[PDB]
């Protein structure tokens, strides 16, 4: 695919532009309005691969750059993820890494308005709590272009694992309306459950009262300053594993199975799937109902 | 200077492309009107080195690459020479005009109008270097380039070093065999190592003294690169003539004879070039076969 390829093209060119730039001690007002472009335009050359005419654009390099460093991820480490093998691409667009530690999500224009008026509040909160979080992990933001048609890409970390596959899948929300997975989706092999197809399984999650405190002071945290952002219409992301992954939980020694659960917030933005009441109101249903999974 | 510094990010970008792309066995005439443009635009992004405004466009990629590899130069060997470490200037081309580090090649500054015509030729010059096995008094051309800052287009020409990466040039000659006087000025010859030309040639008696063998291989060279710049309807052309008096890789080197009356390495080719024009050449012939 062309976007893909083109893609792959700029995440090599931008990661080698940046191991020019030395690192910031501190990041600016203005790196938070920075981009890179590039327009690239071959005339009866390259034939191969990449197409002729395309442009590639990264947001806030220096803020993705530090937002990587403050998750851990090392500049050429991320390279290699990106490009070293090919991504494999899961049911817009939504690809991830071969070595599946990374997520790349299509999303659209006024998706990408909206991440630029939080990012900086989200670096703050990030370095406050030392990349420790339930919320998506961004890594980069980029628009890869073809002919006038624009494509806008998102990379965050796997919340789930690179080894250990995932075995079931829940959106939790809390909603008081209905919510089931339809028929259409349960004929997929790892179909994403909702809210009543966990309370109709009887599902609980067993992990124990020291790492469930833990949880839930990130969780409470995390949510309060969805909250501060008067963002909502999120979920839990819940999967679970039947017998470096920064998302994960280990069931209890006492639990009745032996699991491994990952959970991370999410959102129609943020699902690991292709693209398609007040906010304190929210959040408190959304608590309540997830504090009532274990 | 950032004409420089954007020039070197553009060669290393450019032969960095060109790994992906596997060489051709065969060039096509599309690989002749061929060209690969960047323009690079950082918005309150990183006010270092470069700058944040730029383009660079390299002219027929895939023929220059080809070129490189009839000289007997390597894709590799070509970046490491033009961006390991930073070239030097020298001050006496009409624009810029830089060396190598390790002194193997030169890079000249031309006008658009002159990437115009020579862009006209580049066939013709390609289809000769093959017939002649890259064996040639004329430049060898390994590429050509448009770098831009800000509104500016400066068009820039890399060619192997007629001169030595290791002996110095002493004395140095620009001959043309014109009717009037050419001379060097005053001015000139101040200078450390002063061009010289035709009058300064004659008055100072200059001869080139090499032996038969490799004077018959010169001058039947130097024929048929002097016919294909008539065929080519091309002028105003010199030979460059180097001395290395032995006091202290090289094409276009021929060492003194045994019966010289000095121990010197000379360095001829042809130069201000590839682009009334049959005398130019008979007179031009006339007056270099006649140095020795
Ligand atoms: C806090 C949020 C993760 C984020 C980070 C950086 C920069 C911006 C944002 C953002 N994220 C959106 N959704 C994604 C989402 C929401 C909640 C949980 C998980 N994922 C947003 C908005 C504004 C409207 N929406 C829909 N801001
Ligand atoms: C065109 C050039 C400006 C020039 C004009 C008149 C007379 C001489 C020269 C000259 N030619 C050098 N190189 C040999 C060379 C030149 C061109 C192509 C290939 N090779 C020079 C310098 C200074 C250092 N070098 C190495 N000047």
Redesign the interface.
């Given at each position: 695919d062309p976007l893909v390829g083109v893609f792959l093209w700029g995440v090599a060119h931008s990661i080698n532009?940046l191991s020019?730039?030395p690192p910031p001690v501190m990041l600016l007002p203005?790196?938070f309005?920075?981009?890179?472009?590039?327009?690239?335009?071959?005339?009866?050359?390259?034939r191969?691969?990449l197409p002729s005419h395309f442009k590639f654009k990264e947001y806030c390099?220096?803020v993705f750059r530090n937002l990587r460093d403050r998750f851990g991820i090392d500049d050429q480490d991320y390279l290699v993820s990106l490009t070293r093998n090919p991504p494999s691409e899961s049911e817009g667009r939504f690809l991830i890494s071969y070595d599946r530690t990374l997520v790349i999500k299509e999303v659209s224009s006024e998706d990408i308005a909206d991440m630029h008026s939080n990012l900086s509040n989200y670096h703050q909160y990030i370095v406050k709590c030392h990349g420790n979080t339930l919320l998506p992990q961004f890594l980069g933001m980029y628009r890869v272009s073809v002919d006038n048609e624009d494509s806008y890409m998102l990379v965050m970390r796997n919340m789930f694992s690179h080894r250990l596959p995932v075995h079931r899948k829940y959106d939790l929300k809390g909603s008081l309306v209905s919510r089931e997975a339809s028929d259409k989706e349960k004929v997929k092999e790892l179909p994403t459950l909702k809210d009543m197809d966990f309370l109709n399984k009887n599902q609980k999650v067993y992990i124990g009262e020291e790492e469930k405190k833990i949880f839930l002071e990130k969780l409470k945290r995390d949510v309060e300053f969805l909250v501060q952002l008067k963002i909502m219409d999120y979920s839990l992301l819940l999967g679970i594993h039947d017998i470096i992954d920064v998302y994960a939980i280990r069931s209890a020694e006492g639990a009745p199975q032996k699991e491994v659960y990952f959970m991370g917030l999410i959102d129609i933005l943020t699902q690991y799937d292709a693209k398609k009441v007040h906010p304190e109101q929210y959040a408190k249903r959304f608590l309540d109902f997830i504090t009532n999974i274990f």
């Amino acid at each position: 695919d062309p976007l893909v390829g083109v893609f792959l093209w700029g995440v090599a060119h931008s990661i080698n532009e940046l191991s020019q730039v030395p690192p910031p001690v501190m990041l600016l007002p203005d790196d938070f309005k920075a981009s890179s472009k590039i327009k690239v335009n071959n005339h009866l050359f390259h034939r191969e691969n990449l197409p002729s005419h395309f442009k590639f654009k990264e947001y806030c390099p220096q803020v993705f750059r530090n937002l990587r460093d403050r998750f851990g991820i090392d500049d050429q480490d991320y390279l290699v993820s990106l490009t070293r093998n090919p991504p494999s691409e899961s049911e817009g667009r939504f690809l991830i890494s071969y070595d599946r530690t990374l997520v790349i999500k299509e999303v659209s224009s006024e998706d990408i308005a909206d991440m630029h008026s939080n990012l900086s509040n989200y670096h703050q909160y990030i370095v406050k709590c030392h990349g420790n979080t339930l919320l998506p992990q961004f890594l980069g933001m980029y628009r890869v272009s073809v002919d006038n048609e624009d494509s806008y890409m998102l990379v965050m970390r796997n919340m789930f694992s690179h080894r250990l596959p995932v075995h079931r899948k829940y959106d939790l929300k809390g909603s008081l309306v209905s919510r089931e997975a339809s028929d259409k989706e349960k004929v997929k092999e790892l179909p994403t459950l909702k809210d009543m197809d966990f309370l109709n399984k009887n599902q609980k999650v067993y992990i124990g009262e020291e790492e469930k405190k833990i949880f839930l002071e990130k969780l409470k945290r995390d949510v309060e300053f969805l909250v501060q952002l008067k963002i909502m219409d999120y979920s839990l992301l819940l999967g679970i594993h039947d017998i470096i992954d920064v998302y994960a939980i280990r069931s209890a020694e006492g639990a009745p199975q032996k699991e491994v659960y990952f959970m991370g917030l999410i959102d129609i933005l943020t699902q690991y799937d292709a693209k398609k009441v007040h906010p304190e109101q929210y959040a408190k249903r959304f608590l309540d109902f997830i504090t009532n999974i274990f």
